[PDB]
Amino acid sequence: ADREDDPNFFKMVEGFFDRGASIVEDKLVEDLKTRETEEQKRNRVRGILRIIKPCNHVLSLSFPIRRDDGSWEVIEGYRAQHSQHRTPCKGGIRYSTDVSVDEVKALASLMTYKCAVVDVPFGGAKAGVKINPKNYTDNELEKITRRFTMELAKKGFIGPGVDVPAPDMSTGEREMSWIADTYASTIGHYDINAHACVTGKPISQGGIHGRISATGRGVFHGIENFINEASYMSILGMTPGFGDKTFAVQGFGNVGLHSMRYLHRFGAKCVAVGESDGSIWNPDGIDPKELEDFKLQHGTILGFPKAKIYEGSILEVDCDILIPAASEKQLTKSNAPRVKAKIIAEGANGPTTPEADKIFLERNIMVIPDLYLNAGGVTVSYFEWLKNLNHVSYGRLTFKYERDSNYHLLMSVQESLERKFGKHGGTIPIVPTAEFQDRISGASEKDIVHSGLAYTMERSARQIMRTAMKYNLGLDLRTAAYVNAIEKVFRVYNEAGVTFT
Amino acid sequence: ADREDDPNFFKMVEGFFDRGASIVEDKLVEDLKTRETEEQKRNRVRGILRIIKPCNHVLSLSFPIRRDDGSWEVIEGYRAQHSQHRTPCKGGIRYSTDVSVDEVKALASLMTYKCAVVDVPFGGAKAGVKINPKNYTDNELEKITRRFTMELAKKGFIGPGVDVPAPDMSTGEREMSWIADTYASTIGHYDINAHACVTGKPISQGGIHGRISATGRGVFHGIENFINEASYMSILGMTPGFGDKTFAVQGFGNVGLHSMRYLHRFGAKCVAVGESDGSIWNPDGIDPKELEDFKLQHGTILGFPKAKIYEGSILEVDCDILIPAASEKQLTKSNAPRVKAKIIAEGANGPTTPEADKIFLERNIMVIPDLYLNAGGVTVSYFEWLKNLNHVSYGRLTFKYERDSNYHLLMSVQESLERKFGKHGGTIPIVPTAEFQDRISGASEKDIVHSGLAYTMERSARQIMRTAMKYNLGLDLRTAAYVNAIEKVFRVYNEAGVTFT
Amino acid sequence: ADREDDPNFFKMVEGFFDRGASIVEDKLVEDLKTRETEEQKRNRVRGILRIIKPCNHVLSLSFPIRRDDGSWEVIEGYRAQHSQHRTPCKGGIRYSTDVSVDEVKALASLMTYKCAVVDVPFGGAKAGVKINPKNYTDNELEKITRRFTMELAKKGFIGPGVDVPAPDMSTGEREMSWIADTYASTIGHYDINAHACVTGKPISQGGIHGRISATGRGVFHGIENFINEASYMSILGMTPGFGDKTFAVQGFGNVGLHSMRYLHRFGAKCVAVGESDGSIWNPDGIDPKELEDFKLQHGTILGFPKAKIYEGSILEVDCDILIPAASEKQLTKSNAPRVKAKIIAEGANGPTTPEADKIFLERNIMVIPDLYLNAGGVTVSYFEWLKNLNHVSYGRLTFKYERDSNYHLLMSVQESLERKFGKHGGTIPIVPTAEFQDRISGASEKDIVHSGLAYTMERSARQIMRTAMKYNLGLDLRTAAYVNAIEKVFRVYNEAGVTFT
Ligand SMILES: NC(=O)C1=CN([C@@H]2O[C@H](COP(=O)(O)OP(=O)(O)OC[C@H]3O[C@@H](n4cnc5c(N)ncnc54)[C@H](O)[C@@H]3O)[C@@H](O)[C@H]2O)C=CC1
Ligand SMILES: NC(=O)C1=CN([C@@H]2O[C@H](COP(=O)(O)OP(=O)(O)OC[C@H]3O[C@@H](n4cnc5c(N)ncnc54)[C@H](O)[C@@H]3O)[C@@H](O)[C@H]2O)C=CC1
Ligand SMILES: NC(=O)C1=CN([C@@H]2O[C@H](COP(=O)(O)OP(=O)(O)OC[C@H]3O[C@@H](n4cnc5c(N)ncnc54)[C@H](O)[C@@H]3O)[C@@H](O)[C@H]2O)C=CC1
Numbered sequence A, B, C: 001a002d003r004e005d006d007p008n009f010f011k012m013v014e015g016f017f018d019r020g021a022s023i024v025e026d027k028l029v030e031d032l033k034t035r036e037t038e039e040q041k042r043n044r045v046r047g048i049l050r051i052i053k054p055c056n057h058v059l060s061l062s063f064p065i066r067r068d069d070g071s072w073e074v075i076e077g078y079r080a081q082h083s084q085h086r087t088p089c090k091g092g093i094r095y096s097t098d099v100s101v102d103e104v105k106a107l108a109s110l111m112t113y114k115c116a117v118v119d120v121p122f123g124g125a126k127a128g129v130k131i132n133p134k135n136y137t138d139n140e141l142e143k144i145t146r147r148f149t150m151e152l153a154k155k156g157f158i159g160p161g162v163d164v165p166a167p168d169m170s171t172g173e174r175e176m177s178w179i180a181d182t183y184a185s186t187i188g189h190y191d192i193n194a195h196a197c198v199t200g201k202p203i204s205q206g207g208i209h210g211r212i213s214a215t216g217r218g219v220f221h222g223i224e225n226f227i228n229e230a231s232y233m234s235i236l237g238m239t240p241g242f243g244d245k246t247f248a249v250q251g252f253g254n255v256g257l258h259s260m261r262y263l264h265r266f267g268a269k270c271v272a273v274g275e276s277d278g279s280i281w282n283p284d285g286i287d288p289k290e291l292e293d294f295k296l297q298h299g300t301i302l303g304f305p306k307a308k309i310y311e312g313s314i315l316e317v318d319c320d321i322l323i324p325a326a327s328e329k330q331l332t333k334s335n336a337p338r339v340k341a342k343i344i345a346e347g348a349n350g351p352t353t354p355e356a357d358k359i360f361l362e363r364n365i366m367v368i369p370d371l372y373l374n375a376g377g378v379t380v381s382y383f384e385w386l387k388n389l390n391h392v393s394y395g396r397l398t399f400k401y402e403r404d405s406n407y408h409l410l411m412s413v414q415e416s417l418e419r420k421f422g423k424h425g426g427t428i429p430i431v432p433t434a435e436f437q438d439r440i441s442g443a444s445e446k447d448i449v450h451s452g453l454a455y456t457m458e459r460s461a462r463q464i465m466r467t468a469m470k471y472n473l474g475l476d477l478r479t480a481a482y483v484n485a486i487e488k489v490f491r492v493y494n495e496a497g498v499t500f501t
């Protein structure tokens, strides 16, 4: 998208890592309380850091499918497993003609660090199939997905205990259903956990409430934790809260649409929505329900009645918050000086080059990094995986017990008070509030997903802020996130003896 | 038992399914939001329904055992796995000379729909060994059970992740213990979940509190949910409640005895008990403890001192509630007109022919169907399976923490009140009621089984009633149950792409 | 095909077995060198024989396929494994709407006894899929075959070490190629012997020279061994040899066509060819090349220019040798009195009922039984299986060495003679005959198949003749074959301890 500043994607992520490694290297050496206090301490710390960076296993595939017209075609595919310091590996499947070994390796490493940031016990992985799904029938896409699943399974690149895929660009519920069905019907036929081989499944198939919207929901929570922190909003020259703010959204897919829904719900105003074919704009606000309904009907956002076909880059629209939610390397050395927003919330994976990060720093623009902000997807995938391993819906064993227990608890307060203020205090009814009445039976699956996600995004934001203050990083939240990720992954490699050697 | 009306058991169940299918076919088509809205929608729906009905896998066995006298004998066995839209498969093992491929296939399909009715995530299965256990020593029954287990295991028809058996007619705790022991000692020696290969185990071997009586306990809860619904008792010309009612029980086994115990406990009167050799009768009431104690002593029901040997069919005894709890196809065209009970509670599997269902409908007789009413067995088997997968007894990690937490909670109310009503109010002791003092530590295994079962039977009864109302089915509860079952199973097949094809 | 005499196929084969059992029971008892010479001996022999008759494992399947027009259809399938006294099991796959559990069990048991007759170390098995293949496109038949393979593999009913299928009615090279490809590409991906999971493969995929024509070639060898034995030809009143004889063939498939080719090659005259739509007749002879070429061109036998459309049963055509090579139970008590032929060579499996056998005995008609006569198919399948296990083509390692060795051997005779008869004898060239020059390099795959088959059919014929004289069975060759089969299978069960009970 830019021939001036177009770094190799894997190496760009390695650069981000190098930078966080630079900052913590002292802390790692000093923690290390080995008798070698000689600066082979320094040496073993940077030997371990070199082990963490490259992907351990990458599988490249070519397999034939026969198209609906009868033609034979060769499909190309890839899956990278970056780290196995936690198992299984976790990461999505991308259907796109931009798929390549380097793109997949880069996203696989992002998954490792992202999972470490939100304390999700998975190593990183990613897959890609180099096709444009719009050029294939549904029957052909099913054939490609099912065959890809078996080629991965034959070589140990999918399974509930090694590698658990998930949706990404141009895949969703539908593909995940296909993956889970052919895994469970063949190699997983005797495995009690066969349907935990993949997440993002439909509900009828072991999916979890809110997985489709989960990463949008997490984008809201990530922004909210920082947009409500007066210390960061001072440096930006902006007022805490959502009620008065504007935002623009690049990409109207699963991440972009649901980020818009939740931000709109809490008083922000969507001004611009950009897509693969063009952009639309309205300074008075775009309604997400109307835009979705139009998009579902016409297969495009152009021509939306209540906004005007906007020319020029969606990334340079004037707004408070820019949400790049499409592909990677969209903000570069070129357009970074014209961005006009004061908060960049990366919903997409790797939308900002390192050169663009430098410009944004100089310019007091806050980039909330992908490592943290889009990790709501993998957090709720983690909940889905646990739901599959546990083989019950949350609360089903305890709803009645817990309901009865709570009423007897409140009755214990009632009877204790009547016992004391006897006859002429009268009857002293203790009853639930409206809000407690609605929790009287304990959490359900929906409650766990919402509160578990909010808990994770908040706990992770505080850890990033703590680390940024400690090292005087200002608005370089990306380096603070990598610092936390590196510290966690380093400790695992260090206390494990590294490897089987 | 009746030459007039003796339909093929598997097809009889298919008939029940066809009825429910015909009622919901419209709702399925409408619901289906696909691009080809012709009756090619109606074609896809009927094609899926044809896939659901037949059993996917049936295994037939012949194996030799050498009897205690030294002779060789050939034993015949069968296990059917009806559906794998949920895994594992679940279903009991029947030892009987009436066992056949068709009987086993019929019961396997009943397990699928039954599990869907109570939201238990298992596909249906069933097994049968064609012997009369009364003609074999305990030593021979152990050798038959252990060998049957190995022949099933070799071909993938038992295992914690494919197929989990359970007791049925003429098997119980003892056979399940044998099954679990030879599975875990051979093929399952390395499997962390080996003891979840079968349910209905003794407590000492991974069984769960109340499994033996669970299906009787569920029969009580199923009746109660309908006997307390004035709308249904109006149509019957009856008074809500148990305190004034009579019932008769065909079959004094695991289902019959415990149904009697719980109904007797809540004020119903047992008037008649029928059994393979004869019946007994007493309009003043039969007490279940005395009857069981007699039966344990003498091996039969007849000659019970405190009732008289009744001649003529147990099914035509005069009572309010008839509980067939023996074999299948007991109520037919023939004796349906002479039933003289107003509620038929099927504890057994398939005790009523479709012709007998017609007659009962015309005479405003309520048949509470097997699909729903005897599903307490599989519900508590499900709890046992989860207990095995979790490897802790319920509450053991939390009893102390929870009890301490509750006392500090009540102290928080106490100190807050004293802090306000100073010593101008004295000491204000907040203490548990007797009821809450029992629950101060949280649920135990017994509590979860009792309240989890009650929760399931209630929630399922409400879904059946809501569906019968919505389609104007009156007292045809069987068709309402199948409607619920079909809708649930259809959605799974639909959103899975049907099969790897 | 005949209401009068249409016995249950499984029990008909059990009748044949009972009959041979009756004749050898004494010989088994006195061989038995145990010292409880009581009529315990008596009793264990009869107990073992009842263990041998029933099938040990039968799997019944239902699976959905989506047809080319888009509709869903449920396919029904069966595989029976009769005995595992030798492993793997061996038997063909039949595509036919007459397929049934009893048909498959019957053919599976025939495979056990057939394999014992020709000393092929396999237990018996058989499979059937209930479809008519001409009502399906090639694409549909491929999906049905591939899916059937996976359903069998999941449950242990196909594999190089348990069960090795092969072609039968309406399957051939094509289907076997599909079976081998999906087995080796999925469950067998790591198995060094994956391509020995099925026989009858095309040559390019591990097949062996002459498998398609093997069972026809064996029919010729079986007839020849008996048609050249003057003692049997006396009782028939006819002249040894082929040069003067006529035959008719019911069924022009893989067995029928190749039986015709080889008999025609050695001077017999084919008068009549019958098939599913009609028969053709010519007392001057039908040429198999021209008939096959016509059949390949028009898809039928009728209208063949050099014969006349014959009406009335092919089985009653007047000829010396009748070869039923279609389905089973074609000769019954009805048409047995009108057969006209002196020799009935059963190429097909079970074409003669026991009642028809009695009539043929009374009329001095020789029935060469299926157990022996069509076993050339399984014999060459056995060679194919061994070729797969050995992973070399026969002779490839030794052609050059053996060639060189033979020339040096002949040169040793030459030089020894010259040394002795010095110059007064000249040069004494020792060179191969034309026949030996063809064998100078040793056997190839083709040579082993031809001579290995001839060796097996001859050795088995003499064992049958020896046994028939021994017990004064005359022309009841079927009972002599079963006697040999039973003796061999009994010896294995006896010295194995029967089973692990
Ligand atoms: N799928 C998930 O759960 C998660 C996805 N992500 C990342 O979010 C990003 C996008 O989210 P997806 O779920 O893939 O959405 P999606 O694949 O459903 O839709 C992507 C949208 O972006 C549009 N698009 C593509 N290139 C564009 C361009 N140059 N300008 C404007 N629009 C463009 C497409 O037309 C489409 O509307 C990806 O980078 C993905 O890796 C991050 C976390 C979780
Ligand atoms: N084995 C499998 O293929 C699947 C297994 N599961 C397991 O079930 C556990 C619980 O999830 P749920 O409690 O189902 O969520 P849930 O109770 O919210 O169920 C959501 C949907 O599943 C339906 N459902 C329940 N039992 C069914 C049955 N026997 N047949 C068809 N549909 C049925 C419900 O009626 C509802 O429509 C999960 O932990 C997961 O491990 C879930 C889905 C598929
Ligand atoms: N075992 C379980 O948890 C469940 C059992 N069922 C069904 O309940 C029925 C029986 O319950 P079981 O557990 O098998 O109890 P059981 O097998 O321990 O006892 C059955 C009793 O019925 C008697 N009986 C047999 N044939 C009879 C006939 N023709 N008329 C009258 N009485 C007869 C027997 O003598 C025996 O006393 C079966 O249909 C079974 O499939 C259904 C759901 C759960």
Ligand SMILES: NC(=O)C1=CN([C@@H]2O[C@H](COP(=O)(O)OP(=O)(O)OC[C@H]3O[C@@H](n4cnc5c(N)ncnc54)[C@H](O)[C@@H]3O)[C@@H](O)[C@H]2O)C=CC1
Binding pocket: B195, B203, B204, B205, B206, B207, B386, B387, B388, B389, B390, B391, B392, B393
């Ligand atoms: N691995 C196996 O073979 C068995 C495993 N279990 C597992 O244990 C889990 C929890 O069940 P429990 O804790 O047994 O229920 P529980 O704590 O209620 O105990 C049931 C009975 O087992 C006895 N018991 C406990 N530990 C024992 C030991 N080490 N040796 C002998 N007896 C002992 C207890 O005294 C009690 O009588 C279940 O999920 C089950 O799968 C249970 C029985 C056998």
Ligand SMILES: NC(=O)C1=CN([C@@H]2O[C@H](COP(=O)(O)OP(=O)(O)OC[C@H]3O[C@@H](n4cnc5c(N)ncnc54)[C@H](O)[C@@H]3O)[C@@H](O)[C@H]2O)C=CC1
Binding pocket: C167, C168, C169, C170, C171, C215, C250, C251, C252, C253, C254, C255, C256, C274, C275, C276, C325, C326, C327, C328, C347, C348, C349, C374, C375, C377, C378
């Ligand atoms: N294929 C093999 O290697 C062996 C086959 N067999 C048996 O030989 C018999 C047939 O040979 P296949 O290989 O099946 O050849 P095939 O199935 O390719 O041909 C069978 C022929 O018989 C004809 N046919 C079917 N029913 C008929 C009827 N009622 N009357 C006249 N013709 C009829 C068909 O039109 C076809 O021409 C079967 O019984 C099979 O079990 C026995 C040993 C080996």
Ligand SMILES: NC(=O)C1=CN([C@@H]2O[C@H](COP(=O)(O)OP(=O)(O)OC[C@H]3O[C@@H](n4cnc5c(N)ncnc54)[C@H](O)[C@@H]3O)[C@@H](O)[C@H]2O)C=CC1
Binding pocket: C195, C203, C204, C205, C206, C207, C386, C387, C388, C389, C390, C391, C392, C393
């Ligand atoms: N693993 C597999 O899928 C297969 C394995 N084989 C193994 O080879 C053994 C002997 O059979 P062959 O030696 O093939 O019989 P063979 O030596 O008579 O050759 C049969 C044909 O295979 C061709 N062939 C040989 N090597 C080839 C290669 N690398 N790629 C493609 N075609 C090739 C030859 O040109 C020849 O036309 C079999 O018993 C089997 O173990 C044979 C066929 C398939």
Ligand SMILES: Nc1nc2c(ncn2[C@@H]2O[C@H](COP(=O)(O)OP(=O)(O)OP(=O)(O)O)[C@@H](O)[C@H]2O)c(=O)[nH]1
Binding pocket: A209, A210, A211, A212, A213, A289, A292, A446
């Ligand atoms: N695309 C889209 N998804 C929706 C819409 N409304 C609800 N959902 C999603 O459907 C799932 C179930 O929605 P609800 O039953 O309303 O429950 P919910 O979790 O409170 O919904 P939300 O708070 O909006 O996430 C959630 O993942 C929702 O985000 C919608 O209008 N459009």
Ligand SMILES: Nc1nc2c(ncn2[C@@H]2O[C@H](COP(=O)(O)OP(=O)(O)OP(=O)(O)O)[C@@H](O)[C@H]2O)c(=O)[nH]1
Binding pocket: B209, B210, B211, B212, B213, B289, B292, B446
């Ligand atoms: N056969 C038989 N079983 C009994 C009897 N009494 C209790 N049980 C069962 O034995 C188990 C132990 O009973 P309890 O210790 O009283 O526990 P419980 O769950 O309160 O028992 P119930 O309320 O009677 O179901 C439970 O499964 C009972 O259902 C009895 O008198 N005869």
Ligand SMILES: Nc1nc2c(ncn2[C@@H]2O[C@H](COP(=O)(O)OP(=O)(O)OP(=O)(O)O)[C@@H](O)[C@H]2O)c(=O)[nH]1
Binding pocket: C209, C210, C211, C212, C213, C289, C292, C446
């Ligand atoms: N269907 C059919 N098969 C043939 C014909 N001719 C040969 N075959 C078979 O095709 C294979 C190749 O034949 P050949 O190369 O001549 O080898 P062969 O061993 O001499 O074959 P035979 O003629 O049977 O002796 C062998 O299995 C033959 O049995 C034919 O005309 N029609």
Ligand SMILES: N[C@@H](CCC(=O)O)C(=O)O
Binding pocket: A090, A091, A092, A093, A111, A114, A164, A165, A166, A167, A168, A199, A349, A374, A375, A377, A378, A379, A381
């Ligand atoms: N593919 C998403 C989430 C992966 C998952 O849910 O496992 C990502 O890029 O983070």
Ligand SMILES: N[C@@H](CCC(=O)O)C(=O)O
Binding pocket: B090, B091, B092, B093, B111, B114, B165, B166, B167, B168, B199, B349, B374, B375, B377, B378, B379, B380, B381, B382
């Ligand atoms: N066999 C019981 C259920 C067995 C089980 O608990 O799984 C029935 O017919 O439903």
Ligand SMILES: N[C@@H](CCC(=O)O)C(=O)O
Binding pocket: C090, C091, C092, C093, C111, C114, C165, C166, C167, C168, C199, C349, C374, C375, C377, C378, C379, C381
């Ligand atoms: N299906 C053939 C042969 C099977 C095989 O080659 O194994 C038969 O009936 O004997």
